[PDB]
Design a protein around this ligand. Structure first.
Ligand SMILES: [Ca+2]
Ligand SMILES: [Ca+2]
Ligand SMILES: [Ca+2]
Ligand SMILES: [Ca+2]
Ligand SMILES: [Ca+2]
Ligand SMILES: [Ca+2]
Length: 273
């Protein structure tokens, strides 16, 4: 009768490669099928599953209740959207996926599943290479002579930003439905991203996308604290040869961490641990 809210944060950055990505997709579908069976047994509690693909940013995500007959299909659509190829897989943004997932743990789905165990599996093959900065800041959208005619993002979105609403200045799109923010000249400047507290807030992409700095790590750890701060136990699983115990030490609740995991062992690593 134990209720569960279980998230899966899945790295599809370009370091993964399509071979590992395809195995990961197959293994996760097996995990979800096993969990579906467990959730269908007599006396089973409510099991919500959240699945998010991430690279340069978190991409598509879905939340399902495993009692529903389209639950595995909705998870499958997210798996199918994952591109981990070397050339189009993307960068590695821990901070954004942590905040996206923290937002789910603030959601009505999670809060409504009372007395639940909140669990997250973080599945990655490498250190972060992007992060977010300037969160909640107020960028210039249109700079004119003087100040009185300047347009800031705050003049566009006000105090009531709605994620998915399109915002414009003189018919020019400034915030699109996916939350991409542009200046008046059409240059992309930032994104309206999950803040880890249930909201969507301006941020800019930072980092090189192909290397890791102390700042990248510090921002990743800060984002992680928003996720654990919701009362979530995180299990970090390091795939392959390029992620060490120490690279996952900050992102795992109990310090018991599997690294060097082969993609073909992923389902067992999750289900049998
Ligand atoms: Ca990577
Ligand atoms: Ca790799
Ligand atoms: Ca990707
Ligand atoms: Ca940050
Ligand atoms: Ca000005
Ligand atoms: Ca652990």
């Amino acid at each position: 009768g134990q209720n569960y809210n279980i998230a899966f944060m899945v790295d599809s950055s370009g370091s993964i490669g399509s071979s590992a990505m395809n195995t990961i997709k197959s293994q996760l579908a097996q995990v979800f099928s096993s969990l579906k069976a467990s959730a269908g047994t007599d006396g089973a509690g409510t099991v919500n599953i959240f699945l998010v693909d991430f690279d340069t940013l978190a991409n598509k995500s879905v939340s399902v209740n495993l009692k529903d007959s389209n639950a595995l299909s909705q998870l499958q659509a997210i798996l199918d959207s994952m591109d981990g190829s070397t050339n189009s897989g993307g960068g590695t943004n821990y901070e954004d996926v942590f905040k996206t997932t923290a937002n789910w743990f603030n959601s009505s789905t999670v809060q409504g599943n009372t007395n639940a165990k909140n669990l997250t599996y973080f599945i990655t093959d490498g250190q972060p290479t992007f992060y977010l900065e300037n969160e909640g800041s107020d960028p210039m959208i249109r700079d004119r002579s003087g100040t009185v005619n300047d347009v800031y993002l705050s003049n566009v979105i006000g105090t009531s930003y709605t994620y998915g609403q399109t915002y414009s200045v003189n018919g020019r799109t400034v915030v699109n439905g996916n939350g991409v923010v542009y200046d008046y000249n059409g240059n992309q400047i930032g994104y309206m991203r999950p803040d880890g507290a249930g909201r969507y807030v301006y941020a800019t992409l930072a980092g090189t996308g192909n290397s890791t700095s102390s700042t990248t790590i510090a921002n990743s750890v800060a984002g992680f604290g928003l996720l654990t701060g919701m009362g979530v136990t995180v299990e970090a699983i390091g795939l392959g040869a390029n992620i060490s115990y120490n690279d996952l030490k900050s992102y795992d609740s109990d310090g018991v961490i599997m690294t060097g995991v082969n993609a073909s062992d992923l389902a067992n690593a999750i289900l049998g641990t």
